[PDB]
Amino acid sequence: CTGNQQSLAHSRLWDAVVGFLHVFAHMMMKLAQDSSQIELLKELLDLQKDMVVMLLSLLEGNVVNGMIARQMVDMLVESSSNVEMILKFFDMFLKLKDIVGSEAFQDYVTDPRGLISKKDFQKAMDSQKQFTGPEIQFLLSCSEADENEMINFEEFANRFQEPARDIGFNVAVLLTNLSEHVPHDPRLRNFLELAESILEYFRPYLGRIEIMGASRRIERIYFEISETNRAQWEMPQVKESKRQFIFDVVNEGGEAEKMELFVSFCEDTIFEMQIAAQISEPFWGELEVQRVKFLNYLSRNFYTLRFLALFLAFAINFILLFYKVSDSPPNMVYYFLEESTGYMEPALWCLSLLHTLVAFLCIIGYNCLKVPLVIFKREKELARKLEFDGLYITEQPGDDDVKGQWDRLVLNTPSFPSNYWDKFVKRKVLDKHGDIFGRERIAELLGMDLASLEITAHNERKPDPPPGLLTWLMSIDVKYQIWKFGVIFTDNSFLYLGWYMVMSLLGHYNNFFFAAHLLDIAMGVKTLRTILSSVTHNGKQLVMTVGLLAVVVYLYTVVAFNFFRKFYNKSEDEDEPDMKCDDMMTCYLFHMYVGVRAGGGIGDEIEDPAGDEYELYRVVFDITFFFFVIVILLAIIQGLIIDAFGELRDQQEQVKEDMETKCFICGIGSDYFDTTPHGFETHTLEEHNLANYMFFLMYLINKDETEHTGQESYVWKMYQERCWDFFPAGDCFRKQYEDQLS
């Protein structure tokens, strides 16, 4: 509310804030003395946080060098002494933490129980030199020291830091915002220099983004980021998925689609983090929890299981090499290994059993780890289509979309969005399209009882059922399970792993089948995937080339049958002659097989026509065969392969260099930012970091709506509506305030 903001700015609120700052700072210094007062100190820190929130809310919507920001800067100036006091409090305790973590403090420590005397603490601190002697005295007084004068530095440091975190982060956010919106107040420089330690500590946790304003001008937002969320982002698999997403969007992602795809990628990420958190390691229920631990271990070690299976396949094939065939036992022939040791044959059996076990464990691990993600995506897209497209209400599937036909089933299923977080899609779709399509029809489609809906809203209902395996069996929904199993069958990787299983099982019948598992190297290795993908990229063209080869060989075969048939005797003996081209099929097979394999062509394999009326026609026949089939067609194949390498390479180069040149968000060229030094780097890292955007998204999901600011509520509303206008396109803070900025 701009009017309320101006009224407050002209109000006396400033003087009240000054008084609160003085009291806050002095009360903090007094309260740190004794532990008993720590609770009141916590309340004091929380009240300071609320005041800082008020001040930040006043900042909301402020342009650079806005008068509200300037007045707050003046208020900070007037309350400076208290400000330096508070910042010194914070930095002193942070330095106490890092110093006590330091080994030098430990070496000064000489006590088995780990306590430090007043004097030893003094010596260690003055040896670090960070702290003035008055500061050391204040710290010693704050530290509860027993009559023995020894201190537990661990608790001494730990007590203060949890409460100070929230207020410290809010202070850092306020200082950053004021610094950016008033680049030239030297008082604000001195404050920033004082607070640098706080700014350094909270720098990772701070997340900075830019959004398109409700006021149709760009704004900047600062938010908190949890360490767990950050770490989950840094986890390598998330990074690989991120690079995959970047490559895909850059190669075939439209600008309009791009940002929605980014939102979907962030949602999928969030789901993956949840899964990682659940699987992460810290009488029927006892067996169940042992089962859960076993499944979690399988999911964690899934890739290691795959590598182990590949190693077992390699070992099985190596042992299989010694395998041999002979008519004599160690008319039917006997197959047996040829090795002196005799330990292998038991070893092959053990290896086959272990390989099958590993493969089944891999099936289970893939299921638990990944199938939830697939169901999450499919449920999410189905819910989006129903909410907005209303396809099954109005449009219906094209009837050529097996995915839509299969999805028709899950609609009636009660469980439906088991993986998707929203369980209220049914009610929203009903509220939205019941007016047009009839509430009862939507209810029948969705398997949802209106009366049940209304009763749940009016009053809480708890029909708690007793625990039972039979009751769980009753609960299971057959139709939802059917839909899930259909999706599982459809997905490719599950099919490959089931192939692995089946081949191991048949290998137990005949060990030779285990060789097929060696092909898993393609999936296992990036390099083989690239090399084979080079061929797959042009696979249709290559197949059609093979078809053209068949056609041309067929025509040459027709000519051979009609006129050049005599020359196709492949038998030396005159008494028993073998003519290949007496029959069309034999002629075609002969050509296709021998001539194509032949470098010179069919002429090498058929008798020279020298001294024949048809000699000239045949030499033309052979040479044209050699040029068209032996030479060009293969050349087409190699050229397609070369084109594949070049195409993939230029795709990677294009993706990388576009990423480096332009922002994923605005699309602005690197040159505009780089006019200022390091401009594109700063813009990507701080102004436009996609990771910061995603962190903001989870911050909002975790945050209560009532606490949401106007900005946060604005973004949340557009997220729910799925409109992405808030994301900045072709605009930035720098450009908006450039003339003002310089």
Ligand X SMILES: Cn1c(=O)c2c(ncn2C[C@@H](O)CO)n(C)c1=O
Ligand Y SMILES: Nc1ncnc2c1ncn2[C@@H]1O[C@H](COP(=O)(O)OP(=O)(O)OP(=O)(O)O)[C@@H](O)[C@H]1O
The correct pick among 181, 517, 688, 734 for binding Zn ion (CB under 5 A) is 688
Show contacts with a copy of itself in window 547-576 (CB under 8 A).
547-548, 551, 554-555, 558, 561-562, 565
Partner that binds at residue 701, options Ca ion, a copy of itself, ligand X, none, CB closer than 5 to 8 Å by kind:
ligand X
| Choices 153-161, 500-508, 511-519, 691-699; region in contact with a copy of itself by CB under 8 A | 511-519
Partner that binds at residue 666, options Ca ion, Zn ion, ligand Y, none, CB closer than 5 to 8 Å by kind:
Zn ion
The residue among 190 and 545 lying less far from a copy of itself, judged by its C-beta, is 545
The residue among 544 and 701 lying less far from ligand X, judged by its C-beta, is 701
Measured between alpha carbons, how far is 360 from 498 in angstroms, rounded to an integer? 9
Q: Judged by CB under 5 A, does residue 666 bind Zn ion?
A: yes
Asked if 523 contacts 496 with a C-beta cutoff of 8 angstroms, the reply is yes
The residue among 314 and 719 lying less far from ligand X, judged by its C-beta, is 719
Min. distance of Cβ 262 from ligand Y in angstroms? 10
Partner that binds at residue 130, options ligand X, Ca ion, a copy of itself, none, CB closer than 5 to 8 Å by kind:
a copy of itself
Min. distance of Cβ 63 from a copy of itself in angstroms? 20
Measured between alpha carbons, how far is 97 from 91 in angstroms, rounded to an integer? 10
Show contacts with ligand X in window 407-426 (CB under 6 A).
421
The residue among 258 and 708 lying less far from Ca ion, judged by its C-beta, is 708
**Kindly report the CA angle at 449 between 445 and 454, in degrees rounded to 5?**
135
The correct pick among 54, 350, 635, 685 for binding a copy of itself (CB under 8 A) is 635
- Residue 97 counted as an annotated binding residue: no
Min. distance of Cβ 708 from Ca ion in angstroms? 7
Measured between alpha carbons, how far is 370 from 269 in angstroms, rounded to an integer? 12
Q: Cα dihedral angle (499, 505, 509, 512), rounded to 10 degrees?
A: 50
Q: Judged by CB under 8 A, does residue 119 bind a copy of itself?
A: no
Min. distance of Cβ 684 from ligand Y in angstroms? 4
Signed CA dihedral, 404, 409, 412, 413: sign only: negative
Measured between alpha carbons, how far is 522 from 529 in angstroms, rounded to an integer? 5
Pick left, alpha or beta for residue 396 (phi over 0 → left; psi -120 to 50 → alpha; otherwise beta).
left
Asked if 583 contacts 570 with a C-beta cutoff of 8 angstroms, the reply is no
Q: Cα dihedral angle (485, 489, 492, 495), rounded to 10 degrees?
A: 120
The correct pick among 10, 243, 324, 423 for binding a copy of itself (CB under 8 A) is 324
- Residue 291 counted as an annotated binding residue: no
- Residue 239 counted as an annotated binding residue: yes
The correct pick among 391, 486, 667, 708 for binding a copy of itself (CB under 8 A) is 667
Min. distance of Cβ 256 from ligand Y in angstroms? 11
Position of minimal CB gap to ligand X: 421
Measured between alpha carbons, how far is 425 from 693 in angstroms, rounded to an integer? 25
Could you tell me the CA-to-CA distances from 145 to 42, 582, 646 in Å, in that order? 21, 111, 73
The residue among 274 and 541 lying less far from a copy of itself, judged by its C-beta, is 541
Contacts to Ca ion by CB under 5 A? 706
Show contacts with ligand X in window 233-272 (CB under 6 A).
267, 270
Asked if 739 contacts 64 with a C-beta cutoff of 8 angstroms, the reply is no
Q: Judged by CB under 8 A, does residue 535 bind a copy of itself?
A: yes
Residue with tokens 């962030």: 266
Min. distance of Cβ 421 from ligand X in angstroms? 3
Q: Judged by CB under 6 A, does residue 701 bind ligand X?
A: yes
The residue among 66 and 524 lying less far from a copy of itself, judged by its C-beta, is 524
Asked if 560 contacts 539 with a C-beta cutoff of 8 angstroms, the reply is no
Pick left, alpha or beta for residue 188 (phi over 0 → left; psi -120 to 50 → alpha; otherwise beta).
alpha
The residue among 465 and 730 lying less far from a copy of itself, judged by its C-beta, is 730
- Residue 154 counted as an annotated binding residue: no
- Residue 269 counted as an annotated binding residue: no
> DSSP string spanning 292-340?
HHHHHHHHHTHHHHHHHHHHHHHHHHHHHHTEEEESS-----EEEE--S
3-state DSSP percent of the chain in helix, strand and coil, to 5: 75, 5, 20
Compute the chain's Rg from CA coordinates.
Answer: 37
Measured between alpha carbons, how far is 25 from 83 in angstroms, rounded to an integer? 8
> DSSP string spanning 607-630?
---TTSTTHHHHHHHHHHHIIIII
Asked if 131 contacts 102 with a C-beta cutoff of 8 angstroms, the reply is no
Partner that binds at residue 252, options Zn ion, a copy of itself, ligand Y, none, CB closer than 5 to 8 Å by kind:
none
Partner that binds at residue 421, options ligand Y, a copy of itself, ligand X, none, CB closer than 5 to 8 Å by kind:
ligand X
Q: Which two tokens stand for residue 542?
A: 């290559």
- Residue 706 counted as an annotated binding residue: yes
Residue with tokens 């003046």: 74
Min. distance of Cβ 257 from ligand X in angstroms? 18
- Residue 241 counted as an annotated binding residue: yes
| Choices 216-224, 260-268, 411-419, 435-443; region in contact with a copy of itself by CB under 8 A | 435-443
Partner that binds at residue 521, options Ca ion, a copy of itself, Zn ion, none, CB closer than 5 to 8 Å by kind:
a copy of itself
Could you tell me the CA-to-CA distances from 587 to 366, 573, 579, 604 in Å, in that order? 51, 20, 9, 15
The residue among 296 and 713 lying less far from Ca ion, judged by its C-beta, is 713
Number of residues interacting with ligand X: please give it, by CB under 6 A: 4
Asked if 328 contacts 334 with a C-beta cutoff of 8 angstroms, the reply is yes
Q: What character string, x for contact with a copy of itself (CB under 8 A) and - otherwise, covers 671-710?
A: x--xxxxxx-x-----------------------------
Contacts to ligand Y by CB under 6 A? 659-660, 663-665, 681, 684, 688-690
Could you tell me the CA-to-CA distances from 76 to 50, 62, 64, 170, 346 in Å, in that order? 17, 17, 18, 15, 82
Please state the residue numbers annotated as binding site for caffeine: 421
Binding-site members for Ca(2+) are 706
Binding site listing for ATP: 239-243, 659-664, 684-690
Given the rule CB under 6 A, which residues bind ligand X?
267, 270, 421, 701
